[PDB]
Every structure is written in C-alpha cells, then in structure tokens.
Amino acid sequence: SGFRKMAFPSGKVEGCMVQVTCGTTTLNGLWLDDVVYCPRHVICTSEDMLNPNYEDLLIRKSNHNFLVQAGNVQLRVIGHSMQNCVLKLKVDTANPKTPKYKFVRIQPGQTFSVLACYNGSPSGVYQCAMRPNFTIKGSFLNGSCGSVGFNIDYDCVSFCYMHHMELPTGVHAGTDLEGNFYGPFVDRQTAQAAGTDTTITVNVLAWLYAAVINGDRWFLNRFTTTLNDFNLVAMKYNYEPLTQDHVDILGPLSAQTGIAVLDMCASLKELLQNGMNGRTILGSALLEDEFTPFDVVRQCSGVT
Amino acid sequence: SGFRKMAFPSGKVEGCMVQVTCGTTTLNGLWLDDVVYCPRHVICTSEDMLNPNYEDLLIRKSNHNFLVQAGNVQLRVIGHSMQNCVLKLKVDTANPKTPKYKFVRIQPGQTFSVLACYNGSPSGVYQCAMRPNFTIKGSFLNGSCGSVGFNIDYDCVSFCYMHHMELPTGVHAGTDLEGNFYGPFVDRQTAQAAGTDTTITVNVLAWLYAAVINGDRWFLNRFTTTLNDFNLVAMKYNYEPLTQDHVDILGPLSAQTGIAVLDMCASLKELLQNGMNGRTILGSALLEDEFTPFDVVRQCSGVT
Ligand SMILES: Cc1ccc(OCC(=O)N2CC[NH+](C)CC2)cc1
Ligand SMILES: Cc1ccc(OCC(=O)N2CC[NH+](C)CC2)cc1
C-alpha cells in the first residue's frame, strides 16, 4: 500500500550524461552510441542571446570547439550537426553504457522522470508531466540545460525531453530529442508567456482510483454524471476535456475498484464544486494531476 | 528555479539489488562487497509469522537454502548470520558494482531516497522522511521487502533503511542496515499501532525558505515570535518542538533570504492559525515537511 510520486530508476540515464563546453558555456549532453545530444544554445554568446542566428553562430564553430567530457576523461568530436534546436556531436567512441533506447515526442498530460544534472553529473531525479500549455514545472538551476526526461519500459529508455530554458515565470521549456520544442517556445532570451495551465483531468481520475485502491475513499459520492455534463464543469474549473479515449484508458482502474468511470467523474465534479473542506486524499490537499492511468496501474501492480 | 520533491540518482543502488529466495518467499537483498543483506523474515513460514522464533527457524536453514540471484545469474552463499532483524549472506563474489558506502541510523525528520524493488529489480525511486513516530509513508507492494533507503554524498551511498513490513494502517516500518528497527516495531504479523504522526517543524521552515527563494512569498507576514511562543503553537498543532539546534541549521537559509528564523516561525504560526485560505505554496495546499534544511540548500545550490 501507499502511493508516492515515483520516478523511474535513473541508473540507465546516469550512464549517458556528459558535460559539453563551447567557449565559456558548460551544460549537459546525452551520449547515446557515438552521438552526444545537447541544446544548440551551448554556442550562444551574451551578444546574440536576444536574436541568435544559430546557422551563423555555427559557421564560427569547428569539431574541436565542442569539449565533451564523460567523467574526468575527454571524448574526441569527429563531426557536428544541428537538428532543429539540438546539436548532435559525433564522437569517436560509442558510449559503452548505451541502454536500449527510443526518442518519443510525448503529448500534454504524459508524465516522465527528469534526471537533473550539472557539469554532466546527476544531482537528482523527480517525476513531472508535460503541462497542457507544453511547459513543465521542474527544478532547474543554471548549468542544468541538456538534462533529459525519460520513461523506462523494462530495460528500454524512451527519451522524451531535453531541458533548454526557464520562462520569466520560472516554468520550464524544452525539446524532444529531435530538437523540436514542446509548445510555441524558441531558444531565445525574449520574454515568452505560457498559456493557461489547465488540470489534466484523466490524470486526476487515475489518482482518485489510486486513492480508492489505497483506502482513501471519503470523497466517493452517491452520484454519476455524463461526459457532456462532467465536461461543462471541467471547462469552468480549467480542467482539460475528458474524451472517450480517456474513459477507455481508465477501464482497468474502473474494473479493479468496481467504480464506473462516470461515477468517479461525478465524485470529481463534487470535489471541484465543494472543495476538499480541509480533508486530504493520499496526503494532498489538492487534486494531483501528475499521475497517468499507466503510472497508477504500474505503481499499484509493481512493474520493474 | 522550481522546487521538486527530488530523490538521489539511484544508479549506484540499482547495481546492489539482488533477489533472495528462501523456500517459497522471494524478496530483495542488498549486495555490498561479498555480503547480501536482507530481512530475516525471508525464512518465515505461514505457521510462525504470528510468533516467529528466528533463532529456531534458522537452525532448519543452511547456506544452500538461500538462493541469491543478481540478474539471471546465481551467487554462491558460503555463510549466513543474523544481525538483529537482518540476514547477512556471505557470497563467494564481491559485487563488482559496490559503491563507496556507509551504514547510518537516521533521526526522525531526516529524508532519504527509496529504490522500490521487486524480485531484485528496481521499479521506482521516491523521496520520504523518517516520521517522528519512526514509520515512513512509502509505496510498497508484496515482494518489496529488502528495498533500501539511502542518501548519496557525491559518490558515497549512506544506507539508512531496509523495508520490512506494512502496519495494518498501511504505513511502513523497517530497519537500519544493522537490522535495528526504527521505532518499537518487531518483524511479527501482530497488529502494531503507530504513535502520533507529528509535523517536522524544521523541515516545514526549510520549505518555507525554499518557497521565498523560488518567489512564493504571499505568506510572509509583519510578525516575529520567540522559540517558546512558537513552540506553544507547534505543540497545539501536533508540530515537533523547534530547538536552537534547528534554528542553527536554518542559518544559511536565513542568511540567503534575509528573513530571521523567528520571523519565518511567526509566518508559519499565522499559517497554522489562519490556514492557507485556498492558496498554495510551491504548488502544495498543505505545509510540506519532507524537505530538510540540507535538501533545500542542496536543491537551491545544485549539488551533484
Ligand atoms: C535560450 C537561452 C539560452 C541561454 C541563455 O542565457 C541567459 C544569460 O546568459 N543571461 C544572463 C544575464 N542576464 C541578464 C540575461 C540572461 C538564455 C536563454
Ligand atoms: C514481518 C512479516 C513478514 C512476513 C509477513 O507475511 C504476511 C503473510 O504471509 N500474510 C498473508 C496472509 N495473510 C492472511 C496474513 C499475512 C508478514 C509480516
């Protein structure tokens, strides 16, 4: 029993973290096979951070300008290319600790683990969700750029996020491992606003199921609702619309608890309308939306 | 910026996890040098779980009765001994992935990372605190026994916790790596009640400092208090007494923010008396007590 915000074990990713230095800028790179991936803004100077022309900045750069260190030992860079907002540095050594891996672009509401790194060294692991406004709410200090987000399927690491920057509001933006930003963000030192940070409804429902499974059931009510009625309440409370695809994904949690998805929606509706009244669910005084249905099944079944 | 419940990177501990099987019971062991540590209740049968006499159960056991698997490969057990509530299994192979390590017994209020494991395989990492009643609030399914709690000092792993059991209330009890239970708990299938789960005051203050550092400052008030006045309020709200030792430890957070410790205590006093009024701090609707002053400095300074 017990329900914790739980990250994937980070060992497989720790073995991929390197330091990349260009000029006076040091951040993190991900070393998979004979390629090191990092934020392209590693080449950026104070002058150009406002309106950087990355193709022009890169003309001034050679292989030997990129210093790649894996521990207290240097890697030889034998090629470099820009793919969207990432640099790929070809090195002469395949990372011997390269795990089975994929690059995936996640949808908003999907959760992943972040290994926060500084100078190619892991400092910490935490769990977070791609917000519906394509920001994440991380913990990133200067030097954390190139830190990655991942999910682990048994022994296969799916890399979904590379950290690039902090918005003036102190929320975080980054790319997939093809260098494409989540959301409308650009690797530029211009004020950029996030849109509405809506609540991930399906994830709240999953965590309500986790709560019932773990014996926190005070909030279960006598009501049901319909997807249309629920969604009217959702929209009013800045909750993402619930689709039949979401209802389908919640099916196994429904089956385990014997609580129909629409019944749990009606319980959530009353929690939105009435608030928690100083009570907690799974030790939270607000409705948690950074567990997916997959996370709840995983944690409640013990997948390794 | 941003403040996350952050675990230590778990790689160094992943490399120490093994499966231990005695009869039909399988749980986790920690393989350091040529010793495997696990809960002694691995020898326990349905018959004896109510009033197990471990010394008597162990007479019936030989080295070859303990099956130790590290991956899909078996370790040869060449000795076994009981130390308090742990079995030490001597194996013929030193774990080649043995990190620099210590065994430490932590105090209540101290935080650590748990690598939740099943069949010697890591499933997840999360952060938790030794509660003042010497329970922890984990996420442990059957087969998770032998999962360990640790802190990581640069490259040295301090092991502080081994998981042993779940109380009827679904909170968790375990030992240090010398096999001594935290709290008054015994490795026996008898109903055992936890004492008062009080709030770790010093940890709340540390997290209030983290909040200010991260620009969440709405709760800062015009008041100060004294340790005696604060502690009268603390006791009424089931908060642990604040000592001068706690004030001393908060000194650097005081220094960084320019908020005197007693001023932050007065802010906390008003939050206890007035509640949060539907506002959040660092995205929590309640006062978080599972960050130590050390954790806040670490996360707010980027230690690897
Ligand atoms: C995409 C990106 C990459 C690198 C950046 O570096 C920020 C920087 O160097 N500053 C320090 C001095 N401040 C006054 C201005 C910002 C910012 C954004
Ligand atoms: C310290 C400890 C070690 C092993 C335990 O195993 C519990 C068990 O086998 N049960 C399953 C069947 N239940 C009806 C009764 C409990 C319990 C406590």
Swiss-Prot record, chains A, B:
Ranges where the Peptidase C30 domain occurs: 1-304
Effect ascribed to mutating residue 142 to A: Does not affect ability to cleave and inactivate human TRMT1
Residues of the full protein shown: 3264 to 3567 of 7096
Active site: 41 (for 3cl-pro activity), 145 (nucleophile)
Designated name of the protein: 3C-like proteinase nsp5
Subunit (UniProt): 3CL-PRO exists as monomer and homodimer. Only the homodimer shows catalytic activity. Interacts with host FBXO22; this interaction promotes the proteasomal degradation of nsp5.
Function description: Cleaves the C-terminus of replicase polyprotein at 11 sites. Recognizes substrates containing the core sequence [ILMVF]-Q-|-[SGACN]. Cleaves and inactivates human TRMT1, preventing tRNA guanine(26)-dimethylation of tRNAs. May cleave human NLRP1 in lung epithelial cells, thereby activating the NLRP1 inflammasome pathway. May cleave human GSDMD, triggering alternative GSDME-mediated epithelial cell death upon activation of the NLRP1 inflammasome, which may enhance the release interleukins 1B, 6, 16 and 18. Also able to bind an ADP-ribose-1''-phosphate (ADRP).
Localization (cell): Host cytoplasm; Host Golgi apparatus; Host nucleus
Sequence ranges on the Cytoplasmic membrane side: 1-304
The reaction(s) this protein catalyses: TSAVLQ-|-SGFRK-NH2 and SGVTFQ-|-GKFKK the two peptides corresponding to the two self-cleavage sites of the SARS 3C-like proteinase are the two most reactive peptide substrates. The enzyme exhibits a strong preference for substrates containing Gln at P1 position and Leu at P2 position
Effect of residue 189 to A: Does not affect ability to cleave and inactivate human TRMT1
Coiled-coil region(s): none
Gene: rep
The organism of origin for this protein: Severe acute respiratory syndrome coronavirus 2 (2019-nCoV)
